[PDB]
Amino acid sequence: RFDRDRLFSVVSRGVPEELTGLLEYLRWNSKYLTDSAYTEGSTGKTCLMKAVLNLQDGVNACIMPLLQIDKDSGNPKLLVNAQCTDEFYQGHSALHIAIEKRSLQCVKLLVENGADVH
Numbered sequence: 001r002f003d004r005d006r007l008f009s010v011v012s013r014g015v016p017e018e019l020t021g022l023l024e025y026l027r028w029n030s031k032y033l034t035d036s037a038y039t040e041g042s043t044g045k046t047c048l049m050k051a052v053l054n055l056q057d058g059v060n061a062c063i064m065p066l067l068q069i070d071k072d073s074g075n076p077k078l079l080v081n082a083q084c085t086d087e088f089y090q091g092h093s094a095l096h097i098a099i100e101k102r103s104l105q106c107v108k109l110l111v112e113n114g115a116d117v118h
Contacts, residue, residue: 001025004038004047011051016065023069032075033066034082044085045092052097052106059105067113080115 002025010018026032039046048070051062070079084092095115098106111117 001029007038007047008050011047011060011062011066012054014056014061016062019062019065019069023072026069026073032073032077033070033079034075034077042086043089043092044083045089046079046082046094048079048082048094049084049092049097052094052101052103052110055101055103055106058103063106063109078114080110080113 002022006018007022010016031037033047036044040050048063048066051060051066054060067080080094082093084090093115095107095110095117098110
């Protein structure tokens with residue numbers, strides 16, 4: 001299987017290969033990275049937001065693999081446009097984090113993959 005506390009540890013590392021098995025577990029159990037089980041729970045914050053936090057030299061090699069696994073899972077509510085849900089951080093998104101972290105490389109990467117700019 002493949003689970004949140006493993007995944008959130010992988011998205012902070014410089015090697016994405018530890019994601020192997022995630023697409024198989026998601027697509028065999030009919031689940032997606034936008035589902036509540038794969039979020040920080042207090043805010044509805046996702047693995048992609050946790051990947052856009054802590055960028056090494058302005059980039060993170062795990063972001064494209066996460067977006068590939070999400071597209072390969074067939075998720076209707078695409079991970080790139082997932083937002084926080086609590087009263088304080090409602091509507092916060094990975095694109096807002098990429099902009100505040102000052103990574104034009106990450107903003108380009110998110111917008112190329114269908115990040116809603118509105």
